[PDB]
């Protein structure tokens, strides 16, 4: 009694870091898949989604 | 047999640009405009300050 919001999303468990999948934000963010090659990666990229 | 060519990596060039600014107007502090652009553009904006 007194819950503000109760929303649904991807499971934090089934898709875990054992498969690279990481979602603290609410968005499934992987660390490397498609990337600039000659150039060094970025600290944050929209491509990581 | 007949040794000839000698390979480089980045070519030189015979004709080049040379600038001569004067002070009272110049601002040698700011050399930035973007991120992955400041490495694709300037020097092509730092020789035209």
């Amino acid at each position: 009694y007194g819950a503000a919001v109760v929303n649904i999303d991807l499971n934090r468990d089934f898709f875990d870091t054992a498969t690279g999948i990481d979602l603290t934000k609410g968005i499934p963010l992987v660390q490397d898949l498609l990337v600039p090659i000659g150039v060094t990666a970025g600290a944050e990229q929209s491509a990581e989604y | 047999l007949s040794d000839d060519f000698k390979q480089i990596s980045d070519p030189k060039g015979y004709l080049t640009y040379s600038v001569k600014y004067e002070d009272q107007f110049t601002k040698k502090d700011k050399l930035r405009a973007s991120e992955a652009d400041d490495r694709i553009v300037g020097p092509t904006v730092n020789l035209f300050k």
Binding site: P36, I37, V39 | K6, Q7, I8, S9, P11, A36, T44
Partner: protein
């Protein structure tokens, strides 16, 4: 006139092959629109002045 005979000589005996060394394949998103709609995929590392 002697100095020009040195320029003409240097170009005459110039044998240089160009092996592609160094590159980048910039991710389509960061360099944007005006600078993106101008480069054909991969550029070098030492883009000069233009």
């Amino acid at each position: 006139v002697s100095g020009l005979l040195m320029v003409l000589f240097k170009v005459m005996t110039d044998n240089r092959l160009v092996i592609v060394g160094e590159t980048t394949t910039p991710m389509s998103n960061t360099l944007s629109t005006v600078v993106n709609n101008v480069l054909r995929t991969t550029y070098h590392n030492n883009v000069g002045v233009n």
